[PDB]
Structures are given as C-alpha cells and as structure tokens.
Amino acid sequence: TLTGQTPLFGGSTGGLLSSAETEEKYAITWTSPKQQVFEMPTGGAAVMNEGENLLYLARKEQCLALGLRQLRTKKIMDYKIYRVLPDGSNTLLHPKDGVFPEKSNEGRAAVNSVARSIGENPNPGAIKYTGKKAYD
Amino acid sequence: TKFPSFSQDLAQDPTTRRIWYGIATVHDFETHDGMTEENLYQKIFATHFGHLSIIFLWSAGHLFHVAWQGNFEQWIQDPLTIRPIAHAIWDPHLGDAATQAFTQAGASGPVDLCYSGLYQWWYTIGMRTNGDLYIGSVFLMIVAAVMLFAGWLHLQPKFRPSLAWFRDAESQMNHHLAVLFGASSLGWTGHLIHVAIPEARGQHVGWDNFLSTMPHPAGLAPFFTGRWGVYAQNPDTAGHIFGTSEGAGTAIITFIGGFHPQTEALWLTDIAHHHLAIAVMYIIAGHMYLYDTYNESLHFQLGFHLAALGVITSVVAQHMYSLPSYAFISQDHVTQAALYTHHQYIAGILAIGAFAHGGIFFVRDYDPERNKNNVLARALEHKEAIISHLSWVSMFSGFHTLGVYVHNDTVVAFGTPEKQILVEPIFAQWIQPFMSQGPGDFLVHHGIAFSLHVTVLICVKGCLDARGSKLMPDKKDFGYSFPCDGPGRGGTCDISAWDSFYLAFFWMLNTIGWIVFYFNWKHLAIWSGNEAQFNTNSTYLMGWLRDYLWGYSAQLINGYTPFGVNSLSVWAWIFLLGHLCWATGFLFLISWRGYWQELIETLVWAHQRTPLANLVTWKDKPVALSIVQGRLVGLVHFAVGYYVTYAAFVIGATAPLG
Amino acid sequence: KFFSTAPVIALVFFTLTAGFLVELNRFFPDILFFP
Amino acid sequence: ELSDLQIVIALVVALLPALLALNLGSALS
Amino acid sequence: LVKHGGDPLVGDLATPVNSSGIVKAWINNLPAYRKGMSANARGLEIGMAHGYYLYGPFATSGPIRGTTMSLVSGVLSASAVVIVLSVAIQIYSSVSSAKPLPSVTTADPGSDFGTKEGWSAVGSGFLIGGCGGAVIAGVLSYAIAAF
Amino acid sequence: LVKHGGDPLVGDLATPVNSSGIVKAWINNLPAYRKGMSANARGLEIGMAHGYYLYGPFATSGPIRGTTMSLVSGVLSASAVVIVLSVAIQIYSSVSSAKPLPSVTTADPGSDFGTKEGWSAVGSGFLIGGCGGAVIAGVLSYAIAAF
Amino acid sequence: SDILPAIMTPLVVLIGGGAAMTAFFYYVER
Amino acid sequence: SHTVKIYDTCIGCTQCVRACPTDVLEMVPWDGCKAGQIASSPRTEDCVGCKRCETACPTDFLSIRVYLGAETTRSMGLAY
Amino acid sequence: LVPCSESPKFQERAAKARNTTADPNSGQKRFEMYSSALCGPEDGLPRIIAAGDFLIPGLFFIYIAGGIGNSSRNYQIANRKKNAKNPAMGEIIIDVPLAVSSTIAGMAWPLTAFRELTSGELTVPDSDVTVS
Ligand code: CL7
Ligand code: CL7
Ligand code: CL7
Ligand code: CL7
Ligand code: CL7
Ligand SMILES: CC1=C(C/C=C(\C)CCC[C@H](C)CCC[C@H](C)CCCC(C)C)C(=O)c2ccccc2C1=O
Ligand code: SF4
Ligand code: SF4
C-alpha cells in the first residue's frame, strides 16, 4: 500500500495545500543507495534516507521533476509515481509498463497517432458546423 | 459549474478562467456547444433586436434628460451664450465648492454641459419645447418596447424565422437599399419639409396642425406636374433669423448652396432637396437590382459592413464640421471638436473591427477549394508581396516623415528655422469649408498616411497570415485567438491573428490620434485667432508638444487646484483617470502571465494558512488571467485610457476658449 | 581578422561616413535645396 | 418645465421595455 | 521557539506565530473556532466585535465628522457594511461546499463554517451582532461625550 | 403566456401570474421560500423587511405626525405590530400541524414553515428583524432629515 | 419629483449594482 | 485537456518523450518509419501544455502537435 | 509662394542670423543662397516644391542609395560564390577585397540597371521564391 520512509525534511510552505486532501496527491517512491541530499521541488534541501523513500507531492510535474532532473541524475532510476486519491487509491502512473516511455515496449498502443501529416490537415471552412476539429 | 451554459470545456474549468472566458465567449454564438447554423442565425436575429432596443433607449435617455434637466428652451432663446446641458448631477460626494462650480448654464443645481450637438440637432430638426423632447423620449421608450417585444416574439417558435429568411440575403440587400434606406430618406424629407423648415421659418407645426398646414401654397398643383419649379419658390433671405418670421422664404426644396449666415449651417431646404434626391436614387437602384463567400460567412458580412460603417463615420466626421447641417453647431467649438474626435475614434474602431472579422473569416469560414481562384485566393497567392509593398510604403513614408520632423526639430532647436524642410501641399492647393493647407498640414497628412499604412500593414499581415506562415504553418488549426505556439521556434508570442488585431489597435489609436490631434490643434489655433501658431510651430515636433499638448492643457489641469475648483474640475480629474487607465494598460501589456501566476500561488497559500480568513474559500481556484486575457485587458485599458484622456483634453482645451 | 569583423569594419566605415558628412557640412554651409 | 405627471408617465413607459428586456434576455439565454 | 513542520510534506511550518501556545490559545478560542458555540453564537460575537470596531473609522474619519450627525453616520455606515457582509455570507453559503480544513493553529476548526446550515446561522448572528455592535458603539460614544 | 393546468384535476391554473419565470424567480427567492436559509434567517429577513416598511405608515400618518416624537411613534408602533406578529407566530406554531404544500409558484416550499421548530426559529428571526427594521427606518429618517 | 435623482441614483448604482453583483455571483457560482 | 496528436512524419528521435515534464508521451513501436518507433500520447489528462515536446521535435512541420482546450486542474498546473 | 528676396519676413530673418560654421559669414552666406528658393509670406521660411528643390537632390540621393544597395547586392553574390558556406566570415567578417571590388562595380548601377532589367536578371521566379 505505497509504504516508504519520508525523506528527512524540516518542512516548507511549498508543500501540499487543501487540494492534497480534497482532490488528489501524488507520491514518488525511489530506492536510494546512500543517505545523500537532494533539492526538494517544493523549495529546500532534503536528505533521502537509505533505501525506499516515499515523497507525497502535489502535482505529477513536481514528482516527475524530482525524478527526471535529480534522481535520474543521481542514477536512481527505480522511482515510481502514484496518483493518490483521498480514499487512498494509489495508482502507478509514470512507468505504467514498468519501462521509461523513451524506450519502446510492446503492449503500448499508438495513442492519438494521426495518419495524415501536418500539411494535409483539413481547413475549418470545410468542416464548419460538423463539430470535427482539424487534428480530428 | 453551470456557467457558462454554452461551453462545457469552460464550465468544467475549476478556476477563475471559467468566469472570464465565459464572459469573453458569451457572444461567439458560432462556438457555443451544439449550435447549428439554423439556431445560430435565429439567435443572432433576436440579439439584434436587443441591440436596437438599446440604441433607442439610449436616444430616449438623451431626450428624457435634456427635457427634464436640460436648458433647451433657454438655449433656443440665446443659442450663442447659453451653454447647453446634458443632465443633472446628483452626487452625494460633491463639496459645496464643486456643486457651485458645476452649477452652470443658469441651472438651479449641479449639471453636466452637453457636448454632443444634440441641442443643435434637435433645434435644426424642429424641436422647440421640452414637450417635443419629452414626447420624443416617451415615443422612443415605446419604440424600444416594440423592438424588444419583437425580438421576443421572433425567438418564439410561432414566428421563429427558419434558415430560409436569412439565406435570402440578396432580397435583404435590395430591401436595405430601397425599402429601408430610400423609404426612410424620403420619409425624413417628409419630416424636413413639414416640420423642420416651417419651424426654421418661425411657423409652429404640431402633430395636430400639420394635417391643417400645407408646406407649400403651390404644393398640390406642383405635385406630379411641373414639380421642380413651384418647389423652388422665394429663397430664404440672408437677413433671415433661424426660427423667426424675419426674412422667412417659402421654398421647401432648393439648391441654394453654401450656409445660412445666421446659423453658419447648410440650408434646411438644401438638406431636404438632398434627401429627396438620395431617396429617388436609392429607390431607383433598389428597383434596378466573392458572392459565394459573402453569403456563406457572417464574418465576411460584418467585416464588410464594419469597413463600410468605418468609411461612412469617417466621412460623417469629415463632413459634419466642414459642412455643418445643424444650427449654431459651427459656433459651438467644444461640440464640434467633441463630435469630430468622437466619430473619428469610432471610425477607427469600426475599421479595425472590419479587419478583425476579416481574420476571423480567414480562420473559420474561408475554404480554399470552395473558391478556386477568387479575389481572396489571389490575395493569399502573393501575401509576401502585398505585405512587402505595405511594409515598404510604411518604412518609406515613416522614415521620411519622422526624419523631416526630426530635421525640423533639430534645426529649429539650433535656432536656424530657415533650414526646415518645409514642403508645400501643392495638390491640396489644386483641389482647394476648406482651411489653409500649409507645410505643417503637409507633414501631418503624411504622418497620418504612414500611420494608416502601418495600421493596414498590420491588420492585413494579420488576416493573410491567419491561415499560417513559416513560423506556424497551420494556424487555422489553433484558430483566431490563442496565446502562442510556445517558445518552440525562436518563440511564437503574439503569432495569432487576434494578436494582429491587438497590435493594430495600437496603430489605429496612433493614427486616429494624429488625425484628431491635427484636427483639434488646427481648430484651436483658428478659434483663438492664432492660426499663425499652428502654421509656424506645426513643422517641428516640439511645436506640437509645446503649443498643442503643453499649451492647451493649462486650463484643464487647473480645473482643480489647491486654491479651488472650477467647472473643468471633472475634466481635470477624468484627464488623470485616463492617464491612470492608460498606464494600467501597461501593467497588463508588459507584465505577462507567469509572473502573476507565481504571485497568485503564494496568495492562495497565504489565504489557506491564515486563521479566520481560511474559513472562506474560493469556489474557483484563483489563477492569473490568461495570456490573451492579459493582452485584451491591457488593450482595453490602454484604449479606454487613450480615449478618456483625449476626450478630457478635447473638452478642457476647447471649453474655456468656447 | 578584427578588421574583417562587422563591429570594427562598421566602426571605421561609419566613423568615416559620419566624419565625411560632418566635414562636408563644416565646409559647405546649410544646404536646404540644391542651388 | 417638465411636470411630475410627465416624469411618472415616462418612468411607467420605461418600465415596459424593462419587462420586455427581461423577457427577451431570458429567451436569448 | 523554533520553526518545525508537522507532516513535513504539507506546506505549513509550525512557527512561534502559528503554533505557539499563547497563539493557539487565542485563535482557537476566538468565536470562529471556540468549541461548544452554536453557529448563531459564533456569528453574534464576530458580528458584535466587528460592528463595534467598524463604528469608529466611519464616525471619526468620514465626511460629516465632528458633528453630532457623525455618530449616526458611524452607526448606519457600520450597519451598512455589516449588511453587505451579511449578503456576502448568504451568497457565499449558497454556493460554498468547502469545509474549513484542520491547520497548524486550529486542529479542530469545526463544522459551523463548512455547512450551509452553519453559515446561515453564523450570518444571522453576524448581522444582529454587527448592527448591534455599531449601535452600541454610537450609544457609548454619545454616553461618554455627555459624561 | 397562456393559462394551463398542471395536474388538471387540482384547482390551480398555471398563469403568467403564478407560473411565469420572472414570478417563480421572485417568489421562490423571497426569504419565505428561498432555499438554503436557516429558519432564523428567513425570519430575520421577513422581519427586517416588514419592520422597516411598517415604520412608515405609523411615522407618517399617525396622530403626532410631523413632530420629532413621530419618529419614536413610528419605531415603537412598528415594533408593537412586530411583537403582536411574534405572539401570533408563537401561538400559531403552538397549535399548527399543517405544512406548506407544493404549489404552482413554489414546487419546493420547504419545512421552515411546517414544523414547530421552524416556526419558533422564524419567529425569533421575525421579532429581531422586525424591531430592528423599525429602528433602522427611524434612524434613517432622522439621518436623512438632519442631512 | 425634484428628489427622484436622490432616489433613482442610489437605487440603481448601490441597490441595483449590489443586486446585479449578487445575481451575477450566483449565476457564475452555481 | 490538451489533445496531443502525432502526425505521419515522426522520425522517432525520442526527443519529445525525454522533454515532456508530465510524461504524457510514450515512445511505442511502429513500422511506419525507419526509426521503428512513433510517439504516443496516452496520458493527455496530464498534458500541462508546455509544448516542450513541440520545441524538442526536429521534423519540419513537427509531427507532435499539442492543442490546448478544456483547461482542468491538471492542465492549469495547480498545486492548489 | 513668393521669392524669398521679395518676402519682407525673410529679410528680417536674414538681418539677425545664427552662424552655423566657425566663419562669421556662414549665416549671411546661408540666407544669400536661400534667397533663390520661394518662401511663404507670413513665415518667411524657405519652402520645398515637388525640380531644383526636390527632383535634383532626389536624383543625387537615389544615385547614392542605388550605389550602396548595388554594392551590398554585389558583395552578397561575392559571398555566395567565394565559399560553399556564405555566412561564416562572409557577413560577420567582411572580405575587404571582395567589398572594395563590389564598391568599384557599385556607382556604375545606372548603366548596369539597363543590363539587369534585360532578361529580368534581378528578379527571381515566383516558383523559386520561398513562400509558405
Ligand atoms: C424613465 C426614462 C429614462 C430613460 C429612458 C433614461 N433615464 Mg436616465 N439616468 C442616467 C443615465 C441614463 C442613461 C445612460 C440612459 C440611457 O439609456 C438613460 N438614463 C435613460 C444618469 C444621468 C442618471 C443615473 C441614475 C440612474 O441611472 O437613474 C435611473 C435610470 C433609470 C430609471 C432609467 C432606466 C431606463 C434606461 C433606458 C435603461 C438603459 C439600459 C441599457 C440600454 C441596457 C444596456 C446596459 C448597459 C450598461 C450595457 C439617470 C437618472 C435618471 C433618473 C431618471 C428618472 C431617469 N434617468 C429616467 C430615464 C434619475 O433620477 C437620474 C438623474 O436624475 O440623475 C441626476
Ligand atoms: C474592436 C473591433 C471589433 C468590432 C468593431 C467588432 N468586433 Mg467582433 N465579435 C463578435 C461580433 C461582432 C459584432 C456583432 C460586431 C458589431 O459591429 C462586432 N463584432 C464588431 C462575435 C462574432 C465575437 C464575439 C465577441 C465576444 O464574445 O464578445 C463578448 C465580450 C464581451 C462581453 C466583453 C467585452 C468587454 C469590452 C472589450 C470592454 C469594454 C470596456 C468598457 C467601456 C468599460 C470602460 C469603463 C469606463 C471608464 C467607461 C466577436 C469577436 C471579435 C473579436 C474581435 C477582436 C472583434 N470581434 C473585434 C471587433 C474576437 O476575437 C471575437 C471572436 O470571437 O473571434 C473569434
Ligand atoms: C474612490 C476614491 C477614493 C480613494 C481611492 C480613497 N478615498 Mg478616501 N477616505 C479616507 C481614507 C482613505 C484611505 C486610507 C485611502 C487609501 O486607499 C483612501 N481613502 C482612498 C478617510 C480619511 C475617509 C474615511 C473613510 C472611512 O471611514 O472608511 C472606513 C474605514 C475603514 C472601515 C477601514 C479602516 C481600516 C482598519 C483601520 C484596519 C485595521 C487594521 C488592524 C490593525 C487589524 C488588526 C486588528 C486587531 C487584530 C488588532 C475617507 C473618505 C473618502 C471619501 C471618499 C469619497 C473617498 N475617501 C474617496 C477615495 C469620503 O467621503 C471620506 C471623507 O470624508 O474623507 C474625510
Ligand atoms: C376604530 C375606528 C377607526 C377606523 C374604522 C378607521 N380609523 Mg383611521 N387612520 C388612518 C387611516 C384609516 C384608514 C385608511 C381607515 C380605513 O378603514 C381607517 N383609518 C379607519 C390614518 C390617517 C391614520 C394612520 C394609522 C396608522 O398609520 O396605521 C398604520 C397603517 C398601516 C400599518 C397600514 C398601511 C397599509 C399598507 C400601506 C398597505 C400597502 C399594501 C401594499 C400595496 C401591498 C404590496 C406591497 C409590495 C409587494 C409592493 C389613522 C388614524 C386613526 C387613529 C384612530 C383612532 C383611528 N384612525 C380610528 C379609526 C389614529 O389615531 C390615527 C390618526 O392619527 O389619524 C391621523
Ligand atoms: C401565555 C404563556 C406566556 C407566559 C406565561 C408568559 N409569556 Mg411572555 N413575553 C414577555 C414577557 C413575559 C413576562 C414578563 C412573563 C411573565 O412574567 C411572560 N412573558 C410569561 C415579553 C418579553 C415578550 C413581549 C411582550 C409580552 O407579550 O407582554 C409583556 C408581558 C407581560 C406584561 C407580563 C404578563 C405575562 C403575560 C402572560 C405575557 C403576555 C404575552 C401574551 C401572549 C401577549 C399579550 C399581548 C402582547 C402583544 C403584548 C413576551 C412574549 C411572549 C410571547 C408569548 C407567546 C408569550 N410571551 C407567552 C407567555 C411572545 O411571542 C412575546 C415575544 O415577543 O417574545 C418572544
Ligand atoms: C496584473 C496581472 C494579472 C493579475 C490580475 C488578476 C488575476 C485580476 C485580478 C482580479 C481582479 C481584481 C478582479 C477579480 C475579482 C472581482 C472581485 C471578481 C468579480 C466578478 C465575480 C462575480 C466573478 C494577470 O493575471 C495577468 C495575466 C496576464 C498578463 C498580465 C497580467 C497582469 O498584469
Ligand atoms: S506567449 Fe508567453 S508562453 Fe507563449 S511564446 Fe510568448 S512568452 Fe512563451
Ligand atoms: S514528433 Fe518529433 S520528438 Fe516526437 S517522436 Fe516524432 S520526431 Fe521524435
């Protein structure tokens, strides 16, 4: 149930607000080799504890900024991002296939792939009052 | 949240963007969810009745207020010394000093002097008592009641006109030309001949005695047989005093020409003749009476009609001071300046609106296949050319006009005014109601030329590049108004077509500003007798700053001083309000969304974390205004500021002079 | 190399053109129109 | 010069477009 | 007195200003937060306090100041402001769903703010309190002046 | 606008006067009917409105009219009338069982009138409102007269 | 009806503006 | 939300996906191009609209085009 | 509108004149020169009428402008022919030999213009002209 140790951090003002409770937090869980110090995306410096560390952040971009910019730089590529609802529904998002989206993996459909290239997109004059967009 | 009902995209926005974008898109009926062309035209149809009801209740207010609170009677008695009155001031905030100062034009209590030439216009069209006005007012309220009743009935499915009645635009065009324009034109000649001209000639026509009265003794006999001669009777003597028997003629249709000397206005008889002629021509043309696109696109239609009303209101302004058609309006300098500046600025708004809807057409309605090789297709075929040419004439006219003005400034500063590049307007002399066009007038004309060029440069680079460009090939995809394409390709801020309307509004204001600046400085010079001042000082830019802006500001800005208030207090204050509003536009034009969004994040934090205050919370997550809303609010502030500042200045410049 | 570079090339050229026009104006009096 | 009778009638008339504006507005919504 | 973060991931820092004992005592016992008050009571106290406070700027600073009529201005002005706040509470409550969340300063805010019932109660309180406040302050101003 | 009968067997015709939108808007949003008000609030608004209105006939028309004392008459008279209505509400509620039934104009009347709890709440409101109304109207009459 | 200004102005600006702002508030928050 | 559409001319450089700060984009296998990949946009409910993807795409008439609409909490990028 | 000599205002201006150049006579020389041109009676300030006034200095201006334009064009041709990559040290760094050759071939643009106009050498086909 998305259990880790909270990185040693003195607290900030940059953290979760009412929306964390009311709507949806996020959580990034990563495995640290050492007890090294990392920039908290909320603003500040925290020290990740040895082993599994869990961090409750307020939006996905905050989580993916810790991950992509700082953790991956420290060569820690074990991080998993969970959308946490108020009920406690923890849902893995970022490595949904377990593989970083840059690396092509099977069982991942082409989503919103468009056959026609940018050039060939229809003029809106033609499609006026059909309710179809140019890209659609 | 329900609002806006029409757009679910927005209605599900959890932020304050939902309220702003709602109000912003609440009249873009095209873009409403589940809006079929049929319902679109029907909705539009009903709205128009709303608009017209507004215009009538507006006019109604004019008449009601002038009746109830005006000095229209006292003014008809002494129309050259009595200041005409717009409405009462009730303001609990005025001090005794300010009530005294606004107690003007022999009004018991505090009033606002009128500066729309409404008194003059009404005297000219025959109204002579507060009763005539009060009846005009109550009438116009009832007209508006009828127009509202109409829009209601129409949208009711009983009388809901189907797509047919709107698809019949050709019929509407012919009808507009004749059944509306022609008919109303000669109806208006009806009014002129029956009421205007009589009341001008000192003879009271009421609604109850005009059935009794005949305009022309020889009237019926001339009608249908030898109409031209009988109608051209004894012309009104120069001696004639407006609204008196003295020197009263009997002619109802004439071609006397020039101006009535007492009122320095076009002869009512000449106007009646004009309108009769206009009516005949219009009705004849009606009887006698890009097609694809114009009928297809309502944007093309408005665009065309806005460009139309653009030129029309420009010419109305140009003609209504040169060729005054209202009694005593030529002598009322503040009113004439006010009306010119008013109509010219409205001209510039309608013009730029034309090009705006132009660009909207080019991103919503224009199908390149539909029209294979139309004017529009050819226009886009060589955009780069139309733009390079407009660019060139802009850089040319600009470089040279600014260079010459700066040359003149430099040499005059250095104390050698001889060396000025004074170019005489020869063609103006050739063509020439017309006022002496000197080398000042030449330079300003070229300024205005250049500025109008850059305006059209911008608001065509807009409507042409709307479809796309090398920086953004597919703009039509993203539409008319959108922030940017992001910092992607060296950066794409202000790449939309809406952005071109935005960038061109500035030039429109610059252009009309140069126009009305020139108008008002020239006229203040002549109205003070120092036409020399204009002629000598208009050739270098310090002369405009020192003599026009600096010089004519003094009265206005002394409207209130530590010593006291005068009648110009309210204008001095508006003058500052317009400077503030203008500058506030810079807040939004210069500071862009991100700065604010960070700041507002911190305020959201502080609110949530402040005891007692945290008890209340927003329904709508506060966010900084959008990129485009920033531009729009910027521009509305800048524009409103520009107009209010200049209106204050026009009034305050001219009022003390008279 | 420095000479080739726009800033120095232009600096010399315009310090020449500007001086040239200054010298012209120094010698010939105020010329408003071609005589 | 404008009597109270007249001011009142003007108001009462103006009330008519008011009601009808409410009606038309509702319609257009 | 040191800054520390309760639930460090939450964007709040216990400080001597938000989490001190003296502060928690005051804040948590103000009628917004004080335990065991009917919402009406919360409002009546908030109202009385504000009406009474509001009388002063208006009476002292306004346009007819110094005159006897200034006291009447003060009271009516403060009452007008309270009526406007009463409207604000009603319309706020009408459209509000949100509940006061537990904070550093106030661990148990309560429900009196956070239910439409609560806000209506508070508003009825606030109105009666506020206009009462304002009247009391004018009465006392007249009283002390006379004495 | 046409007359039609919702549930034609019921003796209630929808008319432009009882079922129009403008009317339903007004009626259903008057404090008797307006949704999401505490009964106390309903009463406080009804009271304030009536007290304030009631001041006028009494101050204007009564026996000591014109005099300064007329303002005091107005306020006390209006307050007396409100006290009598307060009594009426109490005794009415005491013996009332009946609930406001859904009508053409008001589909959801509510329970604030229709429960003894509701009427007591409304009456407390109505009393405070009414006497407040009346006092406010006298205060404003003195204010405007002075100004 | 000399006083009609002193009634119509507060009615429209304060009372009508208030009621308008209240109504628009309900309208955009419901 | 913002619709992210990937057009025919995707040369599968994986530049976009490494750019996206909310990882809306997954490099999926595709036989259309020599690259053997294309860009897919499953998670467009997390598209903030930064267009770092478009900025990173090297193809003329970039294949990745983001279309901003129906702003949500997740689009608008609100912590709160 | 009237010869400066004739205009009495101009004579007033001439009497009290500011010397531009060091030499005391610059003011008088300037006014003497300006006497030829026509000036407005009230102002007494030389005016410019759209041949001596505008046409002649127009021609001189156009010659010089054409020269500098042609020289730049010629140097651009030199850039695209000197090296496979024109911009690098062709624009940022100015080849003085190429430039001086371009200038020498400049100021001959009037004679050159006839040849350039013939066979539309200057103009590049619409088809070629890159436009999205
Ligand atoms: C009843 C006829 C009437 C009309 C048609 C009318 N006024 Mg007045 N009116 C004013 C403006 C005005 C405008 C801009 C206007 C134009 O539509 C009108 N009026 C019109 C201000 C000068 C002043 C402000 C106080 C105040 O506004 O007075 C109340 C005015 C009312 C009952 C007239 C309402 C009728 C108007 C047709 C409504 C117009 C609606 C509009 C078309 C819709 C679009 C809205 C727009 C914002 C986008 C005022 C007065 C006032 C009165 C009175 C009695 C009136 N009026 C009366 C009218 C003040 O005492 C009082 C006065 O005495 O002040 C000393
Ligand atoms: C100013 C140039 C202009 C004109 C004259 C004009 N339009 Mg457009 N125009 C419309 C119709 C229209 C009509 C019927 C019409 C009539 O002549 C015009 N226009 C005219 C609709 C099709 C469409 C709907 C617009 C839209 O939906 O309208 C809703 C916007 C509203 C409620 C808010 C407007 C607020 C004002 C800006 C600021 C007023 C300031 C005020 C004085 C206060 C001062 C304080 C004090 C000191 C005095 C529209 C478009 C639009 C634009 C733009 C830029 C324009 N326009 C421009 C113009 C859209 O993008 C936009 C669009 O959606 O393009 C995609
Ligand atoms: C609209 C243009 C305007 C502006 C911008 C403006 N005034 Mg005036 N203005 C005043 C001040 C003022 C300030 C400070 C100010 C700054 O923004 C402004 N104004 C601005 C006052 C002198 C005057 C009185 C207005 C007046 O009395 O308004 C009521 C004032 C009150 C409710 C606010 C008091 C704020 C509190 C003190 C804050 C307390 C903080 C506290 C530490 C928190 C902790 C508490 C606890 C926990 C310890 C006023 C006037 C008045 C007017 C008018 C018409 C104006 N104004 C007009 C304006 C009076 O008639 C009227 C006039 O008669 O002038 C004499
Ligand atoms: C008992 C004998 C008696 C009778 C029958 C009687 N009076 Mg008198 N009586 C009066 C009128 C009156 C009327 C109209 C009337 C009719 O039946 C009577 N009386 C009748 C007033 C002149 C005077 C005032 C009494 C006083 O002011 O009483 C208060 C009046 C009020 C609360 C009722 C006002 C009614 C509302 C306006 C109705 C409006 C409804 C509205 C349209 C609905 C829509 C609203 C909204 C939705 C828009 C009075 C007197 C007074 C007395 C006395 C002793 C009497 N009376 C006596 C009587 C005063 O001293 C006292 C005295 O001072 O006289 C000067
Ligand atoms: C009949 C049950 C009853 C009793 C026993 C009672 N009151 Mg009440 N009662 C009051 C006093 C009082 C006193 C001092 C008192 C005992 O000493 C009582 N009451 C007792 C006043 C503070 C207060 C207002 C004045 C009040 O009504 O009369 C003043 C009290 C008197 C002289 C003392 C005599 C005791 C009587 C048994 C009470 C008479 C109440 C009667 C039902 C109404 C008579 C007509 C009335 C319109 C004046 C009051 C209320 C009120 C009611 C009601 C319904 C009552 N009562 C009822 C009672 C109001 O709503 C009404 C209400 O406004 O309050 C919520
Ligand atoms: C100042 C500023 C802001 C901040 C300004 C904001 C957020 C507007 C501030 C709110 C104003 C004061 C009104 C909002 C509150 C009203 C009380 C709402 C009443 C209407 C409700 C019923 C909806 C921007 O957001 C911005 C965005 C893009 C470019 C420039 C700027 C910019 O300059
Ligand atoms: S508008 Fe703002 S976000 Fe867009 S390109 Fe310009 S700077 Fe970037
Ligand atoms: S759209 Fe651009 S970044 Fe995305 S996969 Fe294709 S080439 Fe790579």
Automatic annotation (TrEMBL), chain A:
It comes from the Bacteria. It is a peripheral membrane protein. GO terms for biological process: photosynthesis. GO terms for cellular component: photosystem I reaction center; plasma membrane-derived thylakoid membrane. Keywords: Photosynthesis, Photosystem I, Thylakoid. PsaD can form complexes with ferredoxin and ferredoxin-oxidoreductase in photosystem I (PS I) reaction center. This is Photosystem I reaction center subunit II.
From TrEMBL, chain B:
GO terms for cellular component: endomembrane system; photosystem I; plasma membrane-derived thylakoid membrane. It is a multi-pass membrane protein. GO terms for biological process: photosynthesis. The chain crosses the membrane at residues 49-68, 133-155, 176-197, 302-323, 343-363, 501-521, 570-590, 632-655. Chlorophyll a B1 binds at H579. It is an enzyme of class 1 (oxidoreductase). It comes from the Bacteria. Phylloquinone B binds at W596. GO terms for molecular function: 4 iron, 4 sulfur cluster binding; chlorophyll binding; electron transfer activity; magnesium ion binding; oxidoreductase activity. Phylloquinone binds at L587, L625. It holds the Pfam family PsaA_PsaB. It catalyses: reduced [plastocyanin] + hnu + oxidized [2Fe-2S]-[ferredoxin] = oxidized [plastocyanin] + reduced [2Fe-2S]-[ferredoxin]. Its EC number is 1.97.1.12. Chlorophyll a B3 binds at Y595. Keywords: 4Fe-4S, Chlorophyll, Chromophore, Electron transport, Iron, Iron-sulfur, Magnesium, Membrane, Metal-binding, Oxidoreductase, Photosynthesis, Photosystem I, Thylakoid, Transmembrane, Transmembrane helix, Transport. InterPro entries: PSI_PsaA/B, PSI_PsaA/B_CS, PSI_PsaA/B_sf, PSI_PsaB. [4Fe-4S] cluster binds at C484, C493. It is found in: Cellular thylakoid membrane; Endomembrane system. Belongs to the PsaA/PsaB family. The PsaA/B heterodimer binds the P700 chlorophyll special pair and subsequent electron acceptors. PSI consists of a core antenna complex that captures photons, and an electron transfer chain that converts photonic excitation into a charge separation. The cyanobacterial PSI reaction center is composed of one copy each of PsaA,B,C,D,E,F,I,J,K,L,M and X, and forms trimeric complexes.
UniProtKB/TrEMBL annotation, chains E, F:
It is a multi-pass membrane protein. GO terms for cellular component: photosystem I reaction center. It is found in: Membrane. GO terms for biological process: photosynthesis. SUPFAM superfamilies: Photosystem I reaction center subunit XI, PsaL (SSF81568). Residues 2-143 form the Photosystem I PsaL reaction centre subunit XI domain. The chain crosses the membrane at residues 71-92, 126-147. Its main location: membrane. Keywords: Membrane, Photosynthesis, Photosystem I, Transmembrane, Transmembrane helix. Belongs to the PsaL family. This is Photosystem I reaction center subunit XI. It comes from Acaryochloris marina (strain MBIC 11017).
TrEMBL record, chain I:
Belongs to the PsaF family. The chain crosses the membrane at residues 54-71, 92-111. Participates in efficiency of electron transfer from plastocyanin to P700 (or cytochrome c553 in algae and cyanobacteria). This plastocyanin-docking protein contributes to the specific association of plastocyanin to PSI. Keywords: Membrane, Photosynthesis, Photosystem I, Signal, Thylakoid, Transmembrane, Transmembrane helix. One of its GO terms (cellular component) is plasma membrane-derived thylakoid membrane. GO terms for biological process: photosynthesis. It is found in: Cellular thylakoid membrane. Its main location: membrane. Disulfide bonds join C4-C39. It comes from the Bacteria. This is Photosystem I reaction center subunit III. It comes from Acaryochloris marina (strain MBIC 11017). The chain holds residues 28 to 165 of 167 of the full protein.
